[PDB]
Amino acid sequence: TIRDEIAGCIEKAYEKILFTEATRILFFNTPKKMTDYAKKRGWVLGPNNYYSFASQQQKPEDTTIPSTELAKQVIEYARQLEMIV
Amino acid sequence: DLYSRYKKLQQELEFLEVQEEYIKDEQKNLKKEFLHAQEEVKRIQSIPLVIGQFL
Amino acid sequence: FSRVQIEHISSLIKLSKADVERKLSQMILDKKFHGILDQGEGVLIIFDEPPVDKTYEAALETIQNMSKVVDSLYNKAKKLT
Amino acid sequence: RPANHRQLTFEEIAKSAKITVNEVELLVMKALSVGLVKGSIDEVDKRVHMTWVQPRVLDLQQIKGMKDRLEFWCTDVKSMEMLVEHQAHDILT
Amino acid sequence: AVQKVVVHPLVLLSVVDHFNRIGKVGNQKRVVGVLLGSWQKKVLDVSNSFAVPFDEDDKDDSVWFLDHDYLENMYGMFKKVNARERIVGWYHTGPKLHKNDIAINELMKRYCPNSVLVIIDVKPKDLGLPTEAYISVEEVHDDGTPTSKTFEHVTSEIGAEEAEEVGVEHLLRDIKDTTVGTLSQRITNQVHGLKGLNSKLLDIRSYLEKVATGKLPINHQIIYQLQDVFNLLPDVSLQEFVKAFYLKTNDQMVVVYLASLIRSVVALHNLINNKIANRDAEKKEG
């Protein structure tokens, strides 16, 4: 429960780091756990490096997706305004 | 008798309950009619209005 | 022109870049000139988002509404003792 | 194109019209003078940003898809607006 | 020419009450009368009118006649009592005009330079503002056919002045007025939205039905261009339409921020003052 929760508490989201310190992440020498996580993470597998692309991530806008619930918010709130009235 | 009058005590209770929602909707519509009356007294009157010398 | 190079805008004003950078940044210090320069690539960019007005209204209300509840502290804590 | 996505590139016009990159200016801007498009040209990447369009013809199986684009607007407004007053239908009375 | 007309409730009722006149005796056809218009400017206004007995054979579906002595001396009656009133055209109850209605306007073009015919509706059903307005004009065609008259639709609106407002505004006695801000805008969101759905639905149903049956043709004097105007804007993002999204989000910022400000002010005043007068009335009386 320590090993899996480190992979759960690392990313998302962390920025770019190098390889040999990801060898320092999971220690050992070149364990198969680094292949299990570099797959699971995803994240990125770069040569001699790692990236958070792309980008940082998914870029929440949120544009007008909240605007619909914004409409609904006062829909039932003006209903509460009519409850007074 | 006890169960009898016990079944007799929710009649006026539900009658007062339907009177609740009634008078609520009543004074809701009459409230908007009073708001309409407010539109009357604020419309009243003129435009154009003659100003005069007050004592 | 908002975005401009520092060397050719110093050619329009006919002055050295040292006291062009320091005088223009001094104009940013005065807030009359909206923008900022860039020393690395020698760029000067102008940008502005003037209105604070809604924050002024908000602050004016709520900051005084503190003293409002302080005024209600007198009446509503008087009925207790 | 379904688009818009109304911003084009110089490679699209220069490859289709098979004209040099210097004459695409005269090309697209003359069409601006004809009146078929009001769009503007982005000359940094040499892109061309179209605006509006000049309707010319169209075709069969287009009245059908037109009913699809319509009926979708029908069920959209019907659903959402019937949801709006579904909430406040009670309080009205 | 004529852009828009103002149809008061007085002229509409003046046709419909005559639909009771000849409607009690029946039977078929329509109520036709002479329209009295008032032209102050390019925008047209209507005040009064009068109806004339009219019959139209079907045999011979192109045969029509009106009483000119009724149009003459009654115009002499209404112009006498009111010098501002004059005939701008005629009217009928439709509901859909038969091809013979053109020659009626061509006969009364001697009375008025441009006669606008007003289709009306005696029984309200659909889809919206009743009646209709058609102006007499010669548009020829892009096909260069010998000049023919297809009446152009004039947008009609309902209005009043002073006394015509007094009568109907007291006669409603039906629904709340307005009320401004709560039920008004949202019921209009139902009506204008849903009646806009079934409008284009049935209108697009006629678009396909006319292609299926009725050819020639109707495709395409305007079919090809009008349908492409429908294909002008799909119109979705990318790109700038995504910028309009969170910009609109940035627009709702201020108003909802102000909303929370009114919430704090309304709650402050009302709650503090009410609890004051509440606790005071209880502690003084009790």
Curated annotation (Swiss-Prot), chain A:
Signal peptide: none annotated. There is a cross-link at K32 (Glycyl lysine isopeptide (Lys-Gly) (interchain with G-Cter in SUMO2)). Component of the 19S proteasome regulatory particle complex. The 26S proteasome consists of a 20S core particle (CP) and two 19S regulatory subunits (RP). The regulatory particle is made of a lid composed of 9 subunits including PSMD8, a base containing 6 ATPases and few additional components. Interacts with DDI2. Interacts with TASOR. Component of the 26S proteasome, a multiprotein complex involved in the ATP-dependent degradation of ubiquitinated proteins. This complex plays a key role in the maintenance of protein homeostasis by removing misfolded or damaged proteins, which could impair cellular functions, and by removing proteins whose functions are no longer required. Therefore, the proteasome participates in numerous cellular processes, including cell cycle progression, apoptosis, or DNA damage repair. Belongs to the proteasome subunit S14 family. This is 26S proteasome non-ATPase regulatory subunit 8. It comes from Homo sapiens (Human). The lineage of its organism: Eukaryota, Metazoa, Chordata, Craniata, Vertebrata.
From Swiss-Prot, chain B:
Signal peptide: none annotated. It is found in: Cytoplasm; Nucleus. It comes from the Eukaryota. Belongs to the AAA ATPase family. Component of the 19S proteasome regulatory particle complex. The 26S proteasome consists of a 20S core particle (CP) and two 19S regulatory subunits (RP). The regulatory particle is made of a lid composed of 9 subunits, a base containing 6 ATPases including PSMC4 and few additional components. Interacts with NR1I3. Interacts with PAAF1. Interacts with TRIM5. Interacts with ZFAND1. Component of the 26S proteasome, a multiprotein complex involved in the ATP-dependent degradation of ubiquitinated proteins. This complex plays a key role in the maintenance of protein homeostasis by removing misfolded or damaged proteins, which could impair cellular functions, and by removing proteins whose functions are no longer required. Therefore, the proteasome participates in numerous cellular processes, including cell cycle progression, apoptosis, or DNA damage repair. This is 26S proteasome regulatory subunit 6B. It comes from Homo sapiens (Human).
Swiss-Prot record, chain C:
Phosphorylated by AMPK. The lineage of its organism: Eukaryota, Metazoa, Chordata, Craniata, Vertebrata. Component of the 26S proteasome, a multiprotein complex involved in the ATP-dependent degradation of ubiquitinated proteins. This complex plays a key role in the maintenance of protein homeostasis by removing misfolded or damaged proteins, which could impair cellular functions, and by removing proteins whose functions are no longer required. Therefore, the proteasome participates in numerous cellular processes, including cell cycle progression, apoptosis, or DNA damage repair. In the complex, PSMD11 is required for proteasome assembly. The chain holds residues 342 to 422 of 422 of the full protein. Highly expressed in embryonic stem cells (ESCs). Expression decreases as ESCs differentiate. Component of the 19S proteasome regulatory particle complex. The 26S proteasome consists of a 20S core particle (CP) and two 19S regulatory subunits (RP). The regulatory particle is made of a lid composed of 9 subunits including PSMD11, a base containing 6 ATPases and few additional components. It is found in: Nucleus; Cytoplasm, Cytosol. Belongs to the proteasome subunit S9 family. Induction: By FOXO4; expression in embryonic stem cells (ESCs) is mediated by FOXO4. Disulfide bonds: none annotated. This is 26S proteasome non-ATPase regulatory subunit 11.
UniProtKB/Swiss-Prot annotation, chain E:
PANTHER family: 26S PROTEASOME NON-ATPASE REGULATORY SUBUNIT 7, EUKARYOTIC TRANSLATION INITIATION FACTOR 3 SUBUNIT F-RELATED. The modification N6-acetyllysine is found at K200, K210. Component of the 26S proteasome, a multiprotein complex involved in the ATP-dependent degradation of ubiquitinated proteins. This complex plays a key role in the maintenance of protein homeostasis by removing misfolded or damaged proteins, which could impair cellular functions, and by removing proteins whose functions are no longer required. Therefore, the proteasome participates in numerous cellular processes, including cell cycle progression, apoptosis, or DNA damage repair. Does not bind a metal ion. This is 26S proteasome non-ATPase regulatory subunit 7. GO terms for molecular function: protein homodimerization activity. PROSITE patterns: MPN (PS50249). The gene is PSMD7. There is a cross-link at K176 (Glycyl lysine isopeptide (Lys-Gly) (interchain with G-Cter in ubiquitin)). One of its GO terms (cellular component) is secretory granule lumen. Gene3D superfamilies: Cytidine Deaminase, domain 2 (3.40.140.10). Pfam families: JAB (PF01398), MitMem_reg (PF13012). GO terms for biological process: proteasome-mediated ubiquitin-dependent protein catabolic process. Signal peptide: none annotated. Residues 5-140 form the MPN domain. Keywords: Acetylation, Isopeptide bond, Proteasome, Ubl conjugation. The lineage of its organism: Eukaryota, Metazoa, Chordata, Craniata, Vertebrata. Belongs to the peptidase M67A family. InterPro entries: EIF3F/CSN6-like_C (IPR024969), JAMM/MPN+_dom (IPR000555), MPN (IPR037518), MPN_RPN7_8 (IPR033858).
